[PDB]
Amino acid sequence: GLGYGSWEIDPKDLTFLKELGTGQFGVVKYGKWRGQYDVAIKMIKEGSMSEDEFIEEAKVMMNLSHEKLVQLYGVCTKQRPIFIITEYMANGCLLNYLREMRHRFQTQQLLEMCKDVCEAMEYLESKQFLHRDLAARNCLVNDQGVVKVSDFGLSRYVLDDEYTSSVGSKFPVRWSPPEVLMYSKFSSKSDIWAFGVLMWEIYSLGKMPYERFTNSETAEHIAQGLRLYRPHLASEKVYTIMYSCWHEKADERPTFKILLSNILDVMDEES
Ligand SMILES: *CCC(=O)N1C[C@@H]2C[C@H]1CN2c1ccc(C(N)=O)c(Oc2ccc(Oc3ccccc3)cc2)n1
Numbered sequence: 001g002l003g004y005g006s007w008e009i010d011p012k013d014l015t016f017l018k019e020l021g022t023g024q025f026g027v028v029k030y031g032k033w034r035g036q037y038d039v040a041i042k043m044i045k046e047g048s049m050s051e052d053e054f055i056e057e058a059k060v061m062m063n064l065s066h067e068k069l070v071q072l073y074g075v076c077t078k079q080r081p082i083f084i085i086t087e088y089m090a091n092g093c094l095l096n097y098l099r100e101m102r103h104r105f106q107t108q109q110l111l112e113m114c115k116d117v118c119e120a121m122e123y124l125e126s127k128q129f130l131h132r133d134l135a136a137r138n139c140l141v142n143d144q145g146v147v148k149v150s151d152f153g154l155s156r157y158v159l160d161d162e163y164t165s166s167v168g169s170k171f172p173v174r175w176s177p178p179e180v181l182m183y184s185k186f187s188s189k190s191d192i193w194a195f196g197v198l199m200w201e202i203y204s205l206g207k208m209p210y211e212r213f214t215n216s217e218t219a220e221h222i223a224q225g226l227r228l229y230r231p232h233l234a235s236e237k238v239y240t241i242m243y244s245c246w247h248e249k250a251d252e253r254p255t256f257k258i259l260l261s262n263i264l265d266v267m268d269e270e271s
Helices: 051-061 094-098 107-126 178-183 188-203 215-223 236-244 256-269
Strands: 014-022 026-033 037-044 072-076 083-086 139-141 147-149
Touching: 014 037, 051 072, 094 139, 094 188, 107 147, 107 188, 107 256, 178 215, 188 236, 188 256, 236 256
Parallel strands: none
Antiparallel strands: 014 026, 026 037, 037 083, 072 083, 139 147
């Protein structure tokens, strides 16, 4: 009411129920809004974020809307540091879900997870919005088994320098094309490279990419023109789609619209 804009939530309307995860970035909890509506609540650690820049960007993020993209409900900012409030995802992080061997996945279930992520990325590309850190650790799973894309654009507002340039000890070297590692050249085509590495994580049941190499050794392998090889659960046609994302020339890599068409054609033939 009085005092709050359309992007602002009053924290007095929240009830807290159970913890969901905890890290250097903060803690995440399950709760209710005005008694009845399921939410997740991310509590940002003091000193970790450029907060006034993030609040201006949240206004734009509120107007993004797609079934396969995690929905932002609003932010709490009158009491630094802030809360970020989103839709609830009961089955948690995609990386941990893939590593549970009890699920005994069929290959048709693995291809449907790839299609969910590709639809979300086609929508972001149509709005000229870059992810900048796409990976299995940044996707979530709901009560019905549907995968959605999370943490979109968030790396722009993080203050710890070990995470922010190619040299840093926490930069995503294993998800980066040659022109990022050599020159810091980010574009639509660096998100396309990262999507190919995510398909390799899904078909490998959550293995670390380049599993016997350090970050330093991975950067050298890539610059010399060498690549990941075929997971045992991927057919020849599926491997051809992930490999097309890794061309040395950025301009010869596909768009997200073309990748979606390739994935639907293989679903029809392998059905
Ligand atoms: C493998 C990663 C992992 O273990 N995580 C990610 C975070 C912390 C821990 C579990 N987890 C998590 C679980 C469930 C939810 C949920 N919605 O039910 C969740 O919710 C989030 C995630 C990210 C947020 O921040 C954000 C910023 C920008 C754009 C979108 C979202 C907010 C809530 N996290």
